[PDB]
Design a protein around this ligand. Structure first.
Ligand SMILES: CN(C)C(=O)c1ccc(F)cc1Br
Ligand SMILES: [Zn+2]
Length: 139
């Protein structure tokens, strides 16, 4: 699990979104595994605005941050899961690293701030849902 909190926005894996998230829906994209909901408290996180392909992500199944190289956000075929059928996930970034289902919502960070959140894994790869394109998260 895990979320990004920026201004009055909460960014979560669409597949981990609660009833409060859906009751306070701002925007959801099933093909990206993202849902944003509205919050009352002000969030302290900064979204990266950049095209970094290096950063650090939190891996809850190792209680460890790992530095990774990651591919630019693209449309990648992702196999069926405990939460989805096999489909093209959009705006997805892969790196070589450890990811289990419960690692979803781990944050990937570069020097500019938050890049995205763990969304996919398996076969020694970790997939991160990019958020850097969502400029509206910052006003
Ligand atoms: C077989 N497979 C794809 C996994 O166990 C997996 C790994 C990480 C993740 F975030 C989601 C899943 Br589903
Ligand atoms: Zn960056």
């Amino acid at each position: 699990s895990g979320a990004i909190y920026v201004g009055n926005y909460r960014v979560v894996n669409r597949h981990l979104a609660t009833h409060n998230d859906w009751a306070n829906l701002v925007w959801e994209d099933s093909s990206r595994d993202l849902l944003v909901s509205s919050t009352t408290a002000q969030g302290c996180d900064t979204i990266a605005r950049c095209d970094c392909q290096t950063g650090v992500y939190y891996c809850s199944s190792r209680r460890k941050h790992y530095p990774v190289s990651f591919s630019k956000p693209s449309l990648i075929f992702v196999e069926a899961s405990e939460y989805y059928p096999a489909r093209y996930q959009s705006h997805l970034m892969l790196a070589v690293g450890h990811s289990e289902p419960g690692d979803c919502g781990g944050i990937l960070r570069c020097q500019h701030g938050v890049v995205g959140i763990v969304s996919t894994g398996g076969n020694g790869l970790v997939g991160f849902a990019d958020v850097r394109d969502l400029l509206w998260l910052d006003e």
